[PDB]
Amino acid sequence: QPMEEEEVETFAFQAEIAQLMSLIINTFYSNKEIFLRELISNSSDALDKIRYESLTDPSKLDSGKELHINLIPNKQDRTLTIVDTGIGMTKADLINNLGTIAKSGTKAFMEALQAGADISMIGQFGVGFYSAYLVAEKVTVITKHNDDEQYAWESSAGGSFTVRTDTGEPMGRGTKVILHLKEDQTEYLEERRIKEIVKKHSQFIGYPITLFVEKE
Numbered sequence: 509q510p511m512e513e514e515e516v517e518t519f520a521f522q523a524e525i526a527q528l529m530s531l532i533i534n535t536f537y538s539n540k541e542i543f544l545r546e547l548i549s550n551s552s553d554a555l556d557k558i559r560y561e562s563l564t565d566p567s568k569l570d571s572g573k574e575l576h577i578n579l580i581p582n583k584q585d586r587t588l589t590i591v592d593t594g595i596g597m598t599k600a601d602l603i604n605n606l607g608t609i610a611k612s613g614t615k616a617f618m619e620a621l622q623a624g625a626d627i628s629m630i631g632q633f634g635v636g637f638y639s640a641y642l643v644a645e646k647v648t649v650i651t652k653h654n655d656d657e658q659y660a661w662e663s664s665a666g667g668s669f670t671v672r673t674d675t676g677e678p679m680g681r682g683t684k685v686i687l688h689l690k691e692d693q694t695e696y697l698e699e700r701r702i703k704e705i706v707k708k709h710s711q712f713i714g715y716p717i718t719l720f721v722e723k724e
């Protein structure tokens with residue numbers, strides 16, 4: 509094929525977010541399973557936004573009426589994907605929410621961690637997404653909002669992330685978090701383990717969750 513050109517935007521994480529990610533990555537914590545509760549909670553919050561917006565404006569559901577969460581483990585590429593049909597993020601929402609803007613709870617949470625707090629407290633500080641780095645070496649976030657095109661955010665930490673127009677499968681609307689799992693965190697690809705953690709932490713979220721299991 510003739511050589512194609514793709515635009516990429518590399519951003520530096522806000523300093524405190526980068527410090528938080530280094531803490532999460534380089535420190536042992538028990539109870540790493542709470543990452544899934546945090547991502548399902550973000551999906552539920554996003555699904556609430558489209559549900560309520562759609563009450564006044566039904567055309568907001570022209571990108572899909574079904575409000576749900578899908579969990580997709582893939583043992584072949586060692587990824588766990590959390591997909592929702594929530595509001596999604598415009599390019600600006602994506603850059604603003606995933607690393608460039610100082611998060612209100614980062615400073616207090618790092619101090620709490622430095623005082624020996626359990627990593628499970630992360631969600632209360634509004635930085636729950638970053639718990640993905642307890643189990644993932646890289647995270648890819650695909651997002652599609654009704655007012656913009658589909659974007660792909662990615663980071664392997666190291667203080668930077670990239671944003672580009674997504675060349676993968678278009679989604680109608682919502683967000684997909686792809687966790688590229690660490691070699692010692694493959695239990696999160698096992699359906700029994702996923703069911704255990706969803707029953708423990710994510711029973712009352714407000715939307716149906718479907719677990720897709722690859723046939724053996």
Ligand SMILES: Cc1cc(C)c2cc1C(=O)NCCCOc1cccc(c1)Sc1cc-2nc(N)n1
Binds near residue numbers: 592594637
């Ligand atoms: C840090 C972060 C990462 C992701 C992938 C999502 C949300 C957040 C976060 O902490 N957001 C703060 C609350 C405002 O959140 C939103 C603002 C605009 C759009 C969205 C969420 S949709 C969304 C964002 C995040 N996760 C999901 N599944 N959906």
Ligand SMILES: [Mg+2]
Binds near residue numbers: 549552553
């Ligand atoms: Mg909620």
